[PDB]
Symmetry: C2
Subunit: 33 residues, 2 copies
């Protein structure tokens, strides 16, 4: 279970980083409009 | 440490949902 929980933290951190990248991209578009 | 890791998953999930909501709203704003 400890390894599974560690893996899930790592998974969510990567999902979150993807979303942060999307938010940056969209904020750039917002600025341009 | 099991419990502390569970708490971290929970914090990262709430953050995930916050960012998902933010992406959706920014997308609707810009017509994507």
């Amino acid at each position: 279970r400890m390894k599974q929980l560690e893996d899930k933290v790592e998974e969510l951190l990567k999902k979150n980083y993807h979303l942060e990248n999307e938010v940056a991209r969209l904020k750039k578009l917002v600025g341009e409009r």
